[PDB]
Amino acid sequence: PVIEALSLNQNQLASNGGYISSQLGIRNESCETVKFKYWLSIKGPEGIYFPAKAVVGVDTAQQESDALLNVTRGFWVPEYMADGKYTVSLQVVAENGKVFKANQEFVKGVDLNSLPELNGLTIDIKNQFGINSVESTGGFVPFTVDLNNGREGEANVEFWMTAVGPDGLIIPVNAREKWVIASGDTYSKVRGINFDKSYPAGEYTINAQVVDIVSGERVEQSMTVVKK
Amino acid sequence: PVIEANLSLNQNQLASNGGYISSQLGIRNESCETVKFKYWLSIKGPEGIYFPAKAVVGVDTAQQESDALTDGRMLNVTRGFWVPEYMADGKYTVSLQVVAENGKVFKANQEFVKGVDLNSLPELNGLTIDIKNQFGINSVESTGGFVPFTVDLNNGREGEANVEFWMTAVGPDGLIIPVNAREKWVIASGDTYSKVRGINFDKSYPAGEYTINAQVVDIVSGERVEQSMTVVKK
Ligand SMILES: [Mg+2]
Numbered sequence: 137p138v139i140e141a142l143s144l145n146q147n148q149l150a151s152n153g154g155y156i157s158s159q160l161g162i163r164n165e166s167c168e169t170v171k172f173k174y175w176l177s178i179k180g181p182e183g184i185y186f187p188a189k190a191v192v193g194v195d196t197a198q199q200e201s202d203a204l205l206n207v208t209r210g211f212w213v214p215e216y217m218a219d220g221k222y223t224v225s226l227q228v229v230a231e232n233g234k235v236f237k238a239n240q241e242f243v244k245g246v247d248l249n250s251l252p253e254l255n256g257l258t259i260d261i262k263n264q265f266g267i268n269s270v271e272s273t274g275g276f277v278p279f280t281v282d283l284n285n286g287r288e289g290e291a292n293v294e295f296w297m298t299a300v301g302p303d304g305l306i307i308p309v310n311a312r313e314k315w316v317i318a319s320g321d322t323y324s325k326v327r328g329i330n331f332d333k334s335y336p337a338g339e340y341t342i343n344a345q346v347v348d349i350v351s352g353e354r355v356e357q358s359m360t361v362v363k364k
Numbered sequence: 365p366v367i368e369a370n371l372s373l374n375q376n377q378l379a380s381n382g383g384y385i386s387s388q389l390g391i392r393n394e395s396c397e398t399v400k401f402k403y404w405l406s407i408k409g410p411e412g413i414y415f416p417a418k419a420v421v422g423v424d425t426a427q428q429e430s431d432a433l434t435d436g437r438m439l440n441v442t443r444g445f446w447v448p449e450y451m452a453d454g455k456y457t458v459s460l461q462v463v464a465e466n467g468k469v470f471k472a473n474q475e476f477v478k479g480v481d482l483n484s485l486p487e488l489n490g491l492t493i494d495i496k497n498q499f500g501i502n503s504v505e506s507t508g509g510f511v512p513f514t515v516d517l518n519n520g521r522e523g524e525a526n527v528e529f530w531m532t533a534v535g536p537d538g539l540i541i542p543v544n545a546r547e548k549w550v551i552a553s554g555d556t557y558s559k560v561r562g563i564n565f566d567k568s569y570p571a572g573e574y575t576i577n578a579q580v581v582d583i584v585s586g587e588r589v590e591q592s593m594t595v596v597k598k
Binding site: 173175177178179181182183184185186187188189190191193194195197198214215216225227229230231232233235237298300302304305306307308309310311312313314325327330332334335336338339343345347349352356360 | 402404407408410411412413415416417420422423424426427428448449459461464465466467469471528530532534537538539540541542544545546547561564566568569570572577581583586588594
């Protein structure tokens with residue numbers, strides 16, 4: 137690796153938001169000097185994406201290279217942004233096109249170390265065997281889905297999954313299903329996606345959504361699989 | 365082109381209570397030889413929503429199956445979907461997507477709106493948001509290129525608007541490239557915040573599709589609106 141790339145001072149914010157301070161480390165392990173560009177960005181719920189940089193005036197700058205690093209950057213997460221899971225991403229693009237990323241999570245207005253949930257309905261969706269990539273010639277990745285209703289009454293849920301990938305692909309992974317889950321019951325399945333040989337190389341976000349139809353609240357779970 | 369894809373929607377405007385959209389899908393094999401492909405219909409919406417057109421009464425157990433079209437022959441199917449009241453008001457894109465056996469991707473897209481006017485600017489309660497690819501540059505070379513965007517935030521309200529604004533490029537390999545840092549503006553009644561802002565796609569950046577994504581927030585109401593535009597790096 138020509139580059140090795142993050143830690144956050146805290147990983148839990150309340151719904152009123154707060155400040156996250158991040159320590160960025162970029163090491164040049166290789167024999168030669170390396171030129172790269174780097175930045176810090178955030179991905180959140182409800183399609184939020186934002187740069188860690190905030191400015192008091194007009195942003196006039198462009199992405200400058202460095203050459204080889206230890207810097208600290210902090211950002212505010214305002215109350216208005218959605219409650220849920222955020223990913224902070226230090227990203228480095230080396231002159232030769234190799235991309236390096238270091239990611240860490242924080243949560244806003246939900247418990248770290250508890251499952252995602254819709255008011256007692258708990259959502260446990262996982263890459264079953266931790267398969268983070270498949271070959272260009274194709275591969276299959278199964279995902280476990282457990283929707284456990286911890287409420288006193290029955291929960292009316294809707295559930296689907298897509299693979300959001302290269303070339304603007306949005307591949308159906310699970311069609312939209314609707315379930316009435318009794319108090320104390322669980323909806324469980326294993327669902328896989330076959331990445332056909334024909335599908336483009338690159339990064340796919342397996343994106344599960346669960347909706348409580350009565351409250352209208354929606355929660356996402358995103359998992360990444362790379363097709364080489 | 366080994367495939368030509370066509371899509372049309374029976375209507376392009378829904379109320380906030382939602383409704384049903386019926387879509388006509390056309391896939392034509394123009395080429396000399398028989399072609400094998402897979403295809404599907406998906407929707408992208410506000411607030412990070414993505415969903416498949418298909419809904420099932422039980423447990424979805426099926427996988428994406430291939431179809432085949434002989435020389436000159438075509439496929440015509442009609443598919444519909446419900447857009448429930450709970451999904452966000454704003455702009456939606458319906459996408460018919462075809463992946464041919466050889467890896468070539470073909471797409472036909474159409475827009476509909478929910479709870480907003482078709483043919484009006486995105487807005488936050490009288491604050492209008494007009495963000496555009498300035499010269500209609502939809503792609504840049506692998507060796508690099510620069511694309512400028514115009515930003516016009518016109519405050520049509522009686523009072524001043526307190527806005528926050530930023531832009532990223534969401535691209536291949538999970539890149540989220542800063543394009544405009546987070547700025548805050550106080551725009552007086554009747555004024556416009558205008559700027560031109562560009563992104564340099566350096567040679568080093570990966571080939572593929574970049575969504576230039578602008579977000580505008582009314583800091584007082586806490587309402588947020590996006591505008592997305594696509595640039596392909598070859
Ligand atoms: Mg209508």
